[PDB]
Design a binder for this molecule. Structure first.
Ligand code: ZMR
Ligand code: ZMR
Ligand code: ZMR
Ligand code: ZMR
Ligand code: NAG
Ligand code: NAG
Ligand code: NAG
Ligand code: NAG
Ligand code: NAG
Ligand code: NAG
Ligand code: NAG
Ligand code: NAG
Ligand code: NAG
Ligand code: NAG
Ligand code: NAG
Ligand code: NAG
Ligand code: CA
Ligand code: CA
Ligand code: CA
Ligand code: CA
Lengths: 386, 386, 386, 386
């Protein structure tokens, strides 16, 4: 049966640890894929870990130069949550160097972008069967969420970006039914920059928190209903969400130009005028991670918060993060549960190796007692292959 | 429920990438079978990758001399599409150095040919249970499709060849029900040569595009109905389909003797008087791959085409190719979807190794935007074992 | 359907061997997790082996320093009984350095304790979904059974400990329904010490046999009904159950202070005034294992027994042991079958390696002919990595 | 539904190849169990390969001294037919150095014998749950079929042996229902020797062809009905079935004392007064294998045959062989199909290695065209570990 998506988000006071795979530690001897850009998505029965492979195993010579973002060898694959991405336990999804996946209640939807940087094609699959296609319309690295898409009342929604990563680009919202695109709208967003959106369903509508790689150290957001009537803006909080970023001063409801160039994929959960910000602890590199509750952060511009929860220590490597949700028809709850994952990147450019990969931790939002701690990657680099 | 097979082929303007396994790259460290002659076939539930193993793993000493075509150690096995052929994730099918497989809607049919070159026996299995047998009738390397068989209204059809590979041989069409041969007809084809046919269902009838190893650089074809009433001929197009071949001149509706000796397994889709030819880019070796749409290529002899789509680059290794189809009762579409796979051969005779193996890419025919690119094997030879 | 848990324990005269995984022997070359604290639990369909990983494989550098009890890399995972804990065949359960699991008849309940030693959090999952949480209330290493919990008429029960391991601590019994804590009671037990309880259902009530790490070489027990009305005491037998321990003299119904400090996790089955004691053969280290039937051992203090069955030889390594049960709705029997497992620890501190791990054997209680023997670990240390 | 077992054996003129695993060749690099005594058994859904592990992998140090027959580390495990016995794809069955397994139509029955040579215990499991037990009654290596048991109308039947292997021993037939022994009869067989019986169902009755290790180069047989009313005798054929054996002279209906000491496990199918003998090609060692049809071999004593089919070449290693059957409710046929497997032993005592193991081939009896050939093991010894 289709996921309704009409209920609100569950009240959350803390984040309980859900999964840890230990990919790089196990990959030291085991047959584990060299991956990056992992994300979690749930069906009514199970939650799966999606990831973009480099078509190579850890501690093997083919992992050479895997800092490279896009190649013909990259494939989207999935394994059960908390397990290592192995050739022996992973399910093939698509050929992709950029990806998105979600379950509507009946079947899996996957989106796999492959091809040249000037003509990339998104291949849409519903239950493993190709159902539609989208070509790059700006001929400049067609790219998508790198996290799960959002589904409401039988439709699934995604955001795609085409154009430069250091200037004004083109941003489109898609409405997809049974793997077929039924509607799409280009966003009227001058001076905005949307990339790698973390989108979640809330009260029959979708909220995406994205990455401004152009000139924003705070995060851009986009909200829309099923007809794709959207709103745009930035998170106003003085507690900035991207990386790199400045120190916490007064925030802006437009793009914070200071330390605005570059970025990292992230997420945030809106609760009225308040926001749950997940961010790196460091302001200059991808190190550490923390959940922060700013009761006025979504619309207000000050740098105040009432809750901080440690996830990864200041001196430990982190990386990508993203939102996922668990629906009522999975949990039995009457609200939509917010969860998140964190990618822990190891290797290049920061470490003296020939390779780049990442493992994953995940947390779910509860309304009971929790604790801050550091759950780092734990691998001892360099490897035999280095 | 049985596959009907009464509908036409879906209109196709381009080919979207469906799967890539990265077998040789992963096999560098992982436990991956040394294979050749892979093919894809689909049930109403899933698509599987079939392959002929050499009974040995990559980067192991037992892969020595695996350029050899036929041995007692070769077995037909299958794994899910896009996954690596591993001993830990593959299903055993038959003991075979030549194979064919297809799903009638209810159960899998596999055909496995093993035995001596002068008395080979095809073992037919329906749902894993031996249901029939065929002995070599010319005592000269009984061989079959190396791709999937075609099924229409509860029957499945195959083509087998017995005799020389550089002269006139014997060619038989088989009709199989629930694993048992109910009818067979020898083809009256003097001056023709049929080997390794790629067969597909279309409007309650079967079209096979095969390999003329004798004296044909263009491809032979055979069409038949359920009663095995057949027609024979060659693809008339001036864009020649086999490898090795000449340059593109005026074609013939008989065998093109020029560069006619030897060959490679291939496929083609008939659309009225038009043909979708898949072929190597090189004319002298198994390198590159491209899809070409000749609107008049099936019956006309000129060398004109209106669409060319790149699949594998001119300098990159390719190999075998074959057709597969997805039926309406799998896709939900009202037509039969044409797809294809490409084997990418690495090692002997062209490379300085002790072994020979191949990985696989696959594409499905869509009527929306697509792109040409190169999706090569990607392995760095020689291996530690060499 | 829910497990009733109203029937008695089956009469047992001997213990038949149920499973042996050979983890360390296979882990010498294979990809097997470095584990400790394994336990078995059964659903109405299957029995599974639960275990706490160190997030590393055997014979790999990441197994360095795995004598360490608690880390952020430890995860609770399960595989089918008798199989090796491998990344390729194991199911992820929780992030935990202390664990408990049980099936109520409908779904799995897992309890995973992770976090700092002064703020640890137990994460409760029902069918893989977080359903509740418990924080450390003494801020001193919140710890649980390391064996399966007990379930009766739709509820599941566990025991947790918080405080010192060489003095008076705090002990709580929990009643859990569908993953949610519905009732909890702190035990009024001055001069008692409860740790790592082996709990089993018997006649709609629960009996736990635990570990007194403080000052007891005999084992403490706690019995309770569904409303958590409990009784406390020690096993009176002169045949002492813990390790280290003294020689067999007259026992006490209170804690036997002699050789009382430290300990090991164990189990015992009450049959009226009689007890089935499972214990190490050695009195100073974790070596050997034996089942002993003392017809008066539960309430009487003498050192007499009528049955002794050998399990592991005196010179062979053992370790943890625990109870598990098989219910009527699994076996078809009209009573609850008692079974047990034994962890066989190899490596540090007793062996010259960089690592510590354990394999597992298991036995079930039958009322027919059996035999004593030694089923040791069988691995030849040190390993290549040492 | 229960297997009826009332129908006759299918008429067989030849043997088509069913499976080949290539265990030792793949085990050279892959993680494959060191095994011996493999056998095949089928349920109404699938056929499985059962095998006795040594609790160690090939090309690992723990495979040292695996020529040893009985240890505490040996376990009975099963994997799907034609697949390699791997820790990642195998199901655990029992702890055993002697085994038997069969499916009654509803659930699997396994028999696992472990323990000391003077007190061994057979542990009976039905659907993975211990249901009964048998102790050694002669205190001299209690041993069983090493092949599948036979099932008729809801009961399953086995043969066990206790006593010396070079003199008169004790032989018992068991009738088992739902894992419980309901009847057993000791065979009145003075001057006979029964070991490692291959038993099959035929017309509501069971025929076992066994091994005379004492003084018989021809094979002993035992037939019985469901009430265990038995007949005993030897295969009269002048074509002797065991190994070692003499040359083919006139046979005896009693034990052929000439070259009678020692032996190997085998099988034979009775068809009236005729017999399908499977045997090694060599008369002094375990080399080669062949199927021979003697139309008068069961009751007549001459050395004539009308069909010989090659299976393994004279210079290639063989080993154990055994019968298996496929029932009507699996095949859809109205008769019981006879099949067989062959173990191909490699290593000690005949080869310069530290280990001993075996791979497996299997054939099923068809009434259509077949071929003789050699399907050897194919591994190149010694291994890196030697
Ligand atoms: C499609 C693509 O190449 N996306 C890039 C991403 C991107 O370049 C930035 O957002 C700027 O546009 O950068 C990063 C990154 O780690 O910052 C990795 C992503 N790699 C992959 N998704 N494979
Ligand atoms: C049955 C058999 O040996 N088929 C051969 C095939 C064949 O020799 C040619 O078509 C000429 O007859 O050649 C090739 C080839 O790569 O050209 C591989 C096939 N190998 C395997 N299918 N194993
Ligand atoms: C939670 C925790 O650290 N438990 C410890 C346990 C414990 O220290 C003693 O019972 C004393 O309190 O000791 C041992 C032990 O081998 O004795 C291992 C356990 N390790 C793990 N369960 N990981
Ligand atoms: C139970 C047992 O040890 N059975 C032995 C078997 C036996 O010794 C002979 O039949 C003589 O009694 O010999 C052989 C053999 O290869 O000849 C292997 C078997 N090994 C195993 N089944 N593990
Ligand atoms: C969710 O959908 C159901 C079924 O349509 C309906 O009962 C309910 O109103 C929706 N939830 C909310 C919170 O409106
Ligand atoms: C990686 O690639 C670089 C250059 O492409 C080369 O110099 C180096 O040797 C490679 N390293 C390995 C381990 O293959
Ligand atoms: C396919 O078979 C169905 C059922 O027999 C029938 O409705 C239809 O006519 C067939 N399709 C075509 C295109 O004729
Ligand atoms: C492969 O075989 C050839 C001859 O058969 C031999 O000379 C060579 O050493 C072998 N190579 C390996 C790696 O086993
Ligand atoms: C077990 O529960 C069933 C169903 O409620 C009941 O028949 C029975 O009384 C209980 N068993 C015992 C031993 O009381
Ligand atoms: C283990 O760690 C110690 C110190 O932490 C170090 O000296 C040693 O080299 C390590 N051993 C291995 C095999 O990594
Ligand atoms: C097999 O059993 C069925 C059902 O009892 C019966 O029809 C038949 O007589 C039996 N088969 C034979 C060959 O007697
Ligand atoms: C095997 O064992 C023997 C003696 O038990 C020993 O001499 C030899 O070194 C061992 N070999 C290996 C490879 O472990
Ligand atoms: C979509 O589903 C049903 C039927 O189309 C409709 O009643 C429901 O309100 C719609 N979902 C929404 C509005 O989210
Ligand atoms: C075969 O199936 C049915 C019943 O035999 C028949 O009606 C149908 O037309 C046949 N299939 C064809 C002609 O493709
Ligand atoms: C709990 O289950 C049912 C319904 O609540 C009740 O009848 C039964 O007696 C209770 N279980 C017990 C007392 O163990
Ligand atoms: C056993 O099964 C049924 C019911 O007990 C009986 O009718 C049948 O004849 C028996 N099976 C035999 C005789 O093989
Ligand atoms: Ca930015
Ligand atoms: Ca040719
Ligand atoms: Ca103690
Ligand atoms: Ca003999």
């Amino acid at each position: 049966v289709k996921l309704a998506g009409n209920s609100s988000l569950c009240p959350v006071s803390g984040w309980a640890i859900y999964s840890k795979d230990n990919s790089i530690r196990i990959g030291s001897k085991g047959d584990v894929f060299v991956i990056r850009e992992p994300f979690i998505s749930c069906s009514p029965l199970e939650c799966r870990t999606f990831f973009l492979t480099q078509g190579a195993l850890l501690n093997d010579k083919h992992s050479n130069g895997t800092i490279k973002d896009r190649s013909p060898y990259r494939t989207l694959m999935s394994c059960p949550i908390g397990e290592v991405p192995s050739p022996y336990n992973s399910r093939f999804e698509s050929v992709a160097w950029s990806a998105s996946a979600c379950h509507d209640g009946i079947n899996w939807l996957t989106i796999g972008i492959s091809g040249p940087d000037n003509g990339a094609v998104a291949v849409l699959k519903y239950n493993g069967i190709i159902t539609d296609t989208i070509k790059s319309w700006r001929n400049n690295r067609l790219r998508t969420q790198e996290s799960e898409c959002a589904c409401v009342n039988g439709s699934c929604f995604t955001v795609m970006t085409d154009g430069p990563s250091d200037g004004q680009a083109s941003y489109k919202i898609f409405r997809i039914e049974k793997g077929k695109i039924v509607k799409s709208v280009e966003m009227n967003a001058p001076n905005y920059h949307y990339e790698e959106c973390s989108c979640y369903p809330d009260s029959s509508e979708i909220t995406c928190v994205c990455r401004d790689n152009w000139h924003g150290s705070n995060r851009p957001w986009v909200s829309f209903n099923q007809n794709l009537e959207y709103q745009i803006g930035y998170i106003c909080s003085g507690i900035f969400g991207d990386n790199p970023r400045p120190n916490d001063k007064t925030g802006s409801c437009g793009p914070v130009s200071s330390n605005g160039a570059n970025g990292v994929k992230g997420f945030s959960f809106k609760y009225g005028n308040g926001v749950w910000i997940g961010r790196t602890k460091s302001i200059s590199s991808r190190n550490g991670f923390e959940m922060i509750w700013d009761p006025n952060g979504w619309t207000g511009t000050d740098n105040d918060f009432s809750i901080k929860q440690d996830i990864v220590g200041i001196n430990e490597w982190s990386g990508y993060s993203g939102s996922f949700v668990q629906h009522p028809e999975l949990t039995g709850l009457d609200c939509i549960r917010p969860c998140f994952w964190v990618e822990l990147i190891r290797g290049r450019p920061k470490e003296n190796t020939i390779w780049t990969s990442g493992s994953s931790i995940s947390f779910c939002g509860v309304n009971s007692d929790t604790v801050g701690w550091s759950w780092p990657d734990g691998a001892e680099l360099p490897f035999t292959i280095d």
